[PDB]
């Protein structure tokens, strides 16, 4: 009787564009689960990465 809107394909594509990134309201955003996705300890989030 209710299929949630976060399983629609538009939501899925827009989420896959972002990835596993969590926003913060007092700080720059951060990568979620930094061990199983193997983010190095110098990088905290995408905006703080600033790729060379």
């Amino acid at each position: 009787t209710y299929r949630p809107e976060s399983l629609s394909k538009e939501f899925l594509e827009e989420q896959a564009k972002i990835g596993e990134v969590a926003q913060r309201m007092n700080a720059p955003p951060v990568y979620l689960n930094p061990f199983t996705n193997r983010i190095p300890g110098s990088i905290l989030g995408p905006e703080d990465a600033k790729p060379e």
Binding site: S6, E14, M25, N26
Partner: peptide
């Protein structure tokens, strides 16, 4: 009740504990 991409359904709140 309604989430945007970049937010998780069921688990997301409006006010977090900092």
């Amino acid at each position: 009740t309604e989430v945007q991409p970049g937010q998780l359904r069921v688990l997301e709140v409006d006010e977090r504990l900092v």
